[PDB]
């Protein structure tokens, strides 16, 4: 029809105006900007502790807020919640769903999320007058499996899931309260903004999103890659963020200049990046390539500055304390392995 | 205890149960079968697993002191490129296909016939880089009205370079030939036939049967002896 | 959540009893006892201690070698058997629960205490006060005295500020020298560095009166102070 041949060419002449308006602004490089200061030297890490307990591959770990304890989620069914600093499981609790991806730990440290190819996801509480593990809320809802979810405050947690749409909730009523649609794509990972405002959500589509926390409406797109994004976090300034995908490449992209900073990929690695998070001041980058062993990436250079090889298998999940003392690296191996 | 408190010594006694109650917990869940359960539309799922009854569906039963654990994953809807090597583990896959679903054709295209979709999905689940050395163990099901349709009809439908006889011992023949010639390692995988019952006793001790071989065969790879 | 003790009663010189306390409402299963002993008219003085699965047991050296602390998991159940009742041995019980992992709350439910009446190297924990009167509206300070030094090399600081009303079992204002309990108001408050120690009330109400103990649990035996004393 002639309404569907017009509304294409205007959404066409719409995306090469929007390319040209991006194109018009990027008018200096990231390198010619970090060439000229000394480059990090050669990061030597050991593994000071190792969280050996797990019997299955190890899917998702996060870092508590007081980064001492952290939280790993195995395929046997286990959500452990460890002791960084002696080696002491604080806490073991058994779950329903043995296939889970992704697990959170809340930041006020009362409750943990978990969740995935269940189209459930629970919430356990950790301060209980009965000394236990319960579960207190389970959030239903999408259509596809869970890929990732962030605690907003107490009461609110943002989910991405496998069915192409994203969900804010309600702990206390358990119905949704926004929801984010527009990707064509599997959506893989969120990544939450430190001043809680925005959130950034990768997809399978090679394309990202920037929201809008209080409206709910996609605000700003990004593209760029060549196929599945299965990273995603921010930089800690908070207008930058960067993403992971299977073609062996890593892009760091700002929120506002819509163009591309960095990209970070080398000619003997052809794996795909499985974890991305930076460091406190925000000049180490460690993404977790599944070619057996993690890597460290200078997020400022684009060159490698030390290799966390220590791994026999995938590496999954990587985190990084609050005040950036100690690294931990989550692998298929069922073996945690803190860094420093 | 050298330099532990009074409540470290605490501490560390909790971590021991802890990891003892993990230890006895994680041998409990390795004496079970993990069977992958795959499919292609209407080709008879939920008859089999009625036929072996008690997101992701998990099954359970026991036969002959063998508790079997099987996943049906139909209602995913979801790229599968994306959440299957979370089963790279499994002991076998099972797959089933209906033998008298040649003639219809799918609701996408007039001439995509039903039958190319399933030879389609096996070819990709057979040579799948997680499931290099994972058996599999093929299903024919609803033979009796496949006999029917094809006394009338004959299938040079869907195998128009096929000369034969217009059987059902033929027919029968050339799809289990034309379906197991989609294997493309012939010498780390094994894949197993039958030919569905109407009683469920002979499709579970097939499965049984196969199940058994499998990890008879793990044995022998495990303990070097082979 | 609650503990309910049974066992006591008027004895004779030659005879033995045994204390039995049931809880109910949480996990007993991972929960540590303890047994605390308080003669009438006097203080409290700690019995016994047995962790979780029944891994390690403690006595009080001061009849060593005569009780017997034994635990049933399936029940919720604790029994502690004494065979040879001396003089010394009129008092009333209690049984605390206890948990120990990086940043739990031990020694905080007390149960109730029963009372039991017979028939006719280590720190210090002193508190030179005895007792102050006070009007409601005005902040009370109370201090308390050790022998040694309280901070552990992993960095705490074992003392545990608690309260007793009359007619009204002990509980939980203070843990680890700093932080507050759950289940009671902002106004009291708790800091001590090395051997002086002090516990701070801000307004006085009509439910404050009653008596104060300092406690040490640095290492064994578990050495309680004199009480401090706030009447109206």
């Known amino acids: 029809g002639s309404e569907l041949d017009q509304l294409r060419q205007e959404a066409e002449q719409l995306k090469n105006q929007i390319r040209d308006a991006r194109k018009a602004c990027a008018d200096a490089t990231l390198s010619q900007i970090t060439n000229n200061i000394d480059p990090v030297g050669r990061i030597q890490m050991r593994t000071r502790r190792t969280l050996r307990g797990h019997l299955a591959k190890i899917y998702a770990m996060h870092w508590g807020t007081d980064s001492r304890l952290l939280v790993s989620a195995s395929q046997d069914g286990k959500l452990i919640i460890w002791d960084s600093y002696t080696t002491n499981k604080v806490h073991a609790i058994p779950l329903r769903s043995s296939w889970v991806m992704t697990c959170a730990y809340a930041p006020s440290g009362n409750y943990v999320a978990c969740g995935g190819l269940d189209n459930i996801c629970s919430i356990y509480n950790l301060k209980t007058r009965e000394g236990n593990v319960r579960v207190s809320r389970e959030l239903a809802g999408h259509t596809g499996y869970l890929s990732c979810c962030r605690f907003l405050d107490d009461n609110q947690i943002v989910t991405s899931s496998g069915d192409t749409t994203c969900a804010l909730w309600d702990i206390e009523t358990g119905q949704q309260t926004t929801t984010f649609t527009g990707h064509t794509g599997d959506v893989m990972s969120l990544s939450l903004a430190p001043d809680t405002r925005l959130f950034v959500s990768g997809a399978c589509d090679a394309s990202a999103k920037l929201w809008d926390v209080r409206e709910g409406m996609c605000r700003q797109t990004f593209t760029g890659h060549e196929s599945d994004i299965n990273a995603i976090c921010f930089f800690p300034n908070g207008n930058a963020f960067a993403t992971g995908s299977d073609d062996a490449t890593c892009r760091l992209f700002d929120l506002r200049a819509d163009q591309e900073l960095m990209t970070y990929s080398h000619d003997n690695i052809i794996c795909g990046i499985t974890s991305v998070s930076f460091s406190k001041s925000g000049r180490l980058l460690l993404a977790g390539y599944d070619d057996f062993n993690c890597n460290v990436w200078d997020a400022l250079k684009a060159d490698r500055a030390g290799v966390l090889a220590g791994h026999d298998n995938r590496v999954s999940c990587l985190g990084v304390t609050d005040d950036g003392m100690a690294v931990a690296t989550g692998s298929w191996d069922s073996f945690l392995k803190i860094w420093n | 205890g050298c330099t532990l408190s009074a409540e470290d010594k605490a501490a560390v006694e909790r971590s021991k149960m802890i990891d003892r109650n993990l230890r006895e917990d994680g041998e409990k869940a390795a004496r079970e079968v993990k069977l992958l359960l795959l499919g292609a539309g209407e080709s008879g799922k939920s008859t089999i697993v009625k036929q072996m009854k008690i997101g992701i569906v998990e099954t359970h039963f026991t036969f002959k002191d063998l508790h079997f654990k099987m996943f049906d994953v139909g209602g995913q809807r979801s790229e599968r490129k994306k959440w299957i090597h979370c089963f790279e583990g499994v002991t076998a896959i099972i797959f089933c296909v209906a033998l008298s679903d040649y003639d219809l054709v799918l609701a996408e295209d007039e001439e995509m016939n039903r039958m190319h979709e399933s030879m389609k999905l096996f070819d990709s689940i057979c040579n799948n880089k997680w499931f290099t050395d994972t058996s599999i163990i093929l299903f024919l099901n609803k033979k009796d009205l496949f006999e029917e349709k094809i006394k009338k009809s004959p299938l040079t439908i869907c195998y128009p370079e096929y000369a034969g006889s217009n059987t059902y011992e033929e027919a029968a023949a050339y799809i289990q030939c034309q379906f197991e010639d989609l294997n493309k390692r012939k010498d780390t995988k094994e894949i197993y036939t039958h030919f569905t019952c109407a009683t469920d006793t002979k499709n579970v001790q097939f499965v049984f049967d196969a199940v058994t071989d499998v990890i008879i065969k793990n044995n022998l790879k495990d303990c070097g002896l082979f | 959540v609650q503990l309910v003790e049974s066992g006591g009663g008027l004895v004779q010189p030659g005879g033995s009893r045994k204390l039995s306390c049931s809880a109910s409402?949480?996990?007993?299963?991972?929960?540590?006892m303890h047994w605390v002993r308080q003669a009438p008219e006097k203080g409290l003085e700690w019995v016994a201690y047995?962790?979780?699965?029944?891994?390690?047991?403690y006595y009080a050296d001061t009849v060593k070698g005569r009780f017997t602390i034994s635990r049933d998991d399936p029940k919720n159940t604790l029994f502690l058997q004494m065979t040879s009742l001396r003089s010394e041995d009129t008092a009333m019980y209690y049984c605390?629960?206890?948990?120990?992992?990086?940043?739990?709350?031990?020694?905080?439910?007390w149960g109730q205490g029963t009372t039991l009446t017979v028939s006719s190297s280590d720190i210090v924990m002193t508190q030179a006060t005895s007792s102050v009167p006070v009007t409601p509206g005005e902040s009370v300070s109370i201090s308390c005295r050790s022998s040694?030094?309280?901070?552990?090399?992993?960095?705490?600081?074992?003392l545990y500020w608690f309260l007793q009303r009359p007619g009204q079992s002990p509980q939980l204002l203070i843990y680890?020298?700093?932080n507050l309990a759950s289940g009671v108001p902002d106004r009291f408050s708790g800091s001590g560095s090395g051997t002086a120690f002090t516990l701070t009330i801000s307004r006085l109400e009509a439910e404050d009166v009653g008596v104060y103990y300092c406690?040490?649990?640095?290492?064994?035996?578990?050495?309680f102070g004199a009480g401090t004393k706030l009447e109206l």
């Open positions: 605390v629960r206890s948990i120990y992992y990086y940043g739990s709350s031990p020694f905080d439910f």
């Open positions: 409402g949480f996990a007993f299963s991972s929960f540590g």
């Open positions: 047995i962790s979780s699965g029944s891994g390690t047991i």
């Open positions: 040694k030094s309280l901070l552990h090399s992993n960095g705490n600081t074992y």
């Open positions: 680890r020298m700093s």
């Open positions: 406690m040490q649990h640095l290492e064994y035996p578990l050495t």
